[PDB]
Amino acid sequence: AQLLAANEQKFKFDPLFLRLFFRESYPFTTEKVYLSQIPGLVNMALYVSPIVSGEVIRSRGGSTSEFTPGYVKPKHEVNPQMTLRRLPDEDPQNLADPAYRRRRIIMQNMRDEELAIAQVEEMQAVSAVLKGKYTMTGEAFDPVEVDMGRSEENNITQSGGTEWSKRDKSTYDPTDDIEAYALNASGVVNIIVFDPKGWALFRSFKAVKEKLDTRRGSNSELETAVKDLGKAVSYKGMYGDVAIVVYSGQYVENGVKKNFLPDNTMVLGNTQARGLRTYGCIQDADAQREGINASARYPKNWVTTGDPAREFTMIQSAPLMLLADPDEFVSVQLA
Amino acid sequence: AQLLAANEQKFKFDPLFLRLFFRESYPFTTEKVYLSQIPGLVNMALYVSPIVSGEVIRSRGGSTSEFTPGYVKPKHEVNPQMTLRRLPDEDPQNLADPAYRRRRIIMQNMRDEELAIAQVEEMQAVSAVLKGKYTMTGEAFDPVEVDMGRSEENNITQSGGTEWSKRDKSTYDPTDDIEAYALNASGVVNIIVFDPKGWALFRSFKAVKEKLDTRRGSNSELETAVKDLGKAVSYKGMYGDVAIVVYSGQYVENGVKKNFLPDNTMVLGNTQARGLRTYGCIQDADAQREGINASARYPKNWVTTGDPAREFTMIQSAPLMLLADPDEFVSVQLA
Amino acid sequence: AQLLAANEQKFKFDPLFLRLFFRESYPFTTEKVYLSQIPGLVNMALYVSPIVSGEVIRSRGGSTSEFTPGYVKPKHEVNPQMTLRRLPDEDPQNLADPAYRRRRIIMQNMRDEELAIAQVEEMQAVSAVLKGKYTMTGEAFDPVEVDMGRSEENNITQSGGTEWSKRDKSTYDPTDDIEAYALNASGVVNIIVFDPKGWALFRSFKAVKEKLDTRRGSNSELETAVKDLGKAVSYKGMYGDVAIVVYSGQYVENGVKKNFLPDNTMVLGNTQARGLRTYGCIQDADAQREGINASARYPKNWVTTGDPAREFTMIQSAPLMLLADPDEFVSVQLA
């Protein structure tokens, strides 16, 4: 059987949300995820004369704690009938070796497994930053709710008398409307990432293209962080002090593709916003014995006997994406 | 006769369709091609409970999983009278000996056999992704039809009603048309490869000229993948987010050179698409006897006696150029 | 733990459809079943000249492929407490040894495995040639559809138009109706398989009673099938050139017995009709580890650890009882 240390992946393919907002991670050593354990923020200094001692500082972070993360654990078989990919310039002599073929199959199954986990880790992020409400469902899970604690004003949808679709396409300037939306953002807005269906509406305005300086090179760091996803994400240009990204990544259902975002929607935030990546206990009998109770991922390979007689490789984790200031992003439902 | 070791070519000149979309290859160990063994696409992760239970994931192949490969075995003769081409740095003194003349004519036959096979493979790939459908024909061979499953929404015909050739060349902006045609691409496009004749009408508009970039290219390693194909491939620049390539390849029929693409056409798509390069078995006694049934190419040299007392060279293969998702591209039929 | 050498069933008990139409069996080597790999029939040898190269015959034709098998795996436990079924003409002295008693109860348990899988094969076969369409389903196995391609011209229902009950049971003749039913058979028909209570009404006609022949012996080799399954199969005699046989077989559901053929049915076919007996792979780690992928049955004895700590016996199969051509039978729904 493959050793547990066979974890040679080193691929970082975070789809534009775990790579820009949810950088820091907090794996937990307890089963449930207790929100009151995060480091939190800090008071100013509390001036004190240098003859008397000062009160010790204590930061706690959040009140509602007893959350519960999902415990996704996809499996795969290693049936040695798959037609292995012809790696460039590899010899055919090595392909005859059963051990090398088995190792190649295990390595490909690891990639397939890790691409299956990040889908949930990004669906959680998308759901968190659209409404601040996110429920976990699935067969045999007892659906668990997650209330991030959003305000109400940070969901402004254009549904009044005048919308961006049913007005003038030559004289209207959306700068004022965008600033009005970003006023209640509890900070300086920096990213106005679009869903391309909703993007095409904004793009039609000439007042946009008359001032959208879409020069190549976003800010010298954003395009460095987003070139890896040449399939899903794209960069439009700079709208002055802010940049525009078009995110079109799709999450696959049992057999069908679906969009992460509703088509005619946009969301505003910052690249410096902090997003928690809290995990939970990897409740495994062997993982407890190897002292890896608190960790991000946990591969395992075993050989089953008798009824489902096969060899399985499984990846298990516990994603409970969170935010510190959920009301800093504003998700505008366009029309 | 020269042995199987006469395979010293190691030249990678696959022309823009086997290198940009069909990079990965899946040679098979059976007469036909079955999509069941193909890894396919990863599914969702399916939240489950803790160690209580766990369900096994199987990656199926869908509905159709049986295709017939396009077997091919072009033959050449090695008559030691053909006047050798004056390749540079070639001394005739160490050339008059037949031991070198034959050894070089063998290599020349290998080169043009491989060139013909690779060019037919590219023709197959273009016929595949220009319209989604495909066929196999030929004298002394049973016709075979191959259907990728392209959606009808990805075959936009420009001739109907609103073309590009009948608009003002200084006021009409074709960005809106490109956006409207690339909206239904099931993924952000970055490659808008044109035709040598089809690019003229697109570029004739003035609005493109100022916005169009020529700055040597700043997209990716794509410029390196283009510089090797200096003859029939030209890289123009930036449309703002996508790259522009004008490709004017040619292939030799019975006696006439023709282009791969229909005259006034263009394609949009992604440079990160998944293009299958499935191959059948090399149904030869020696290949099976040497365990080389699963391979992309098979050279062979022998001498037949009695009626055709001549020495021959063969390169056997069986391409079935296939595309994972045909709906990731848009084929605009310009007019 | 008994090894795979415990294969001593030695019982040939094919019930009248695996013996009359589905004689030829073909265990596949791929998980899914592709009919484009069936050898097919053989034609007359050409009169090739002596001193000339011959021509290679191709034993292929007819795709109709892509059918998946209905994997079946019934378990049993071998707890040594049950009173052993004492076989007639056996030595009772060596029954004292528990090691022999366990080895005998293993085979007594294996017989039930074989019978309970033969019943599933009969369920596959009987209604295979009754409509063409076949839905295989059950718990822990999602429903699967298998369609032969029978035409509506081959499934005449007597209820359409004129019934048979509302007719004179002493003067009317069904010969014209029989010929009309047999005209759309794409081949001569000589079997008139009935249902006993659906055959009583057919026999109720006066002319049929004396018209039916009851001569000794079948045509060539039809009485041979009767001599084996005499409990539920009866051969009335001759009806010109078509044989009258009555199948009153039953299969056991959980605790109740059901008849194989629905009430009012009669099938018109040929004894030489080709009926496939395809199979799937033995999806088991030990099967690949011992190279027994292409097999119909697969015994296994093994020991469970911990929760149901017992020793089990299991047989795995994959019956996909299939017809070479759906248009060789006519299944009249009597009325």
UniProtKB/Swiss-Prot annotation, chains A, B, C:
GO terms for cellular component: host cell cytoplasm; T=7 icosahedral viral capsid; viral capsid. InterPro entries: Major_capsid_GpE (IPR005564). It is found in: Virion; Host cytoplasm. Keywords: Capsid protein, Host cytoplasm, Late protein, T=7 icosahedral capsid protein, Virion. It comes from the Viruses. Gene3D superfamilies: capsid protein of prophage domain, putative capsid protein of prophage domain like. The keyword Transcription regulation does not apply. The keyword Lipid biosynthesis does not apply. Assembles to form an icosahedral capsid with a T=7 symmetry. The icosahedral capsid is about 60 nm in diameter and composed of 415 major capsid proteins. The assembly is primed by the interaction between capsid assembly protease and portal dodecamer, and major capsid proteins assemble cooperatively to form the procapsid with the help of capsid scaffolding protein. Major capsid protein forms hexons and pentons of the icosahedron. Viral genomic DNA is packaged into the procapsid through the portal vertex. Belongs to the lambda phage major capsid protein family. Homomultimer. Interacts with FI protein. This is Major capsid protein. It comes from Escherichia phage lambda.
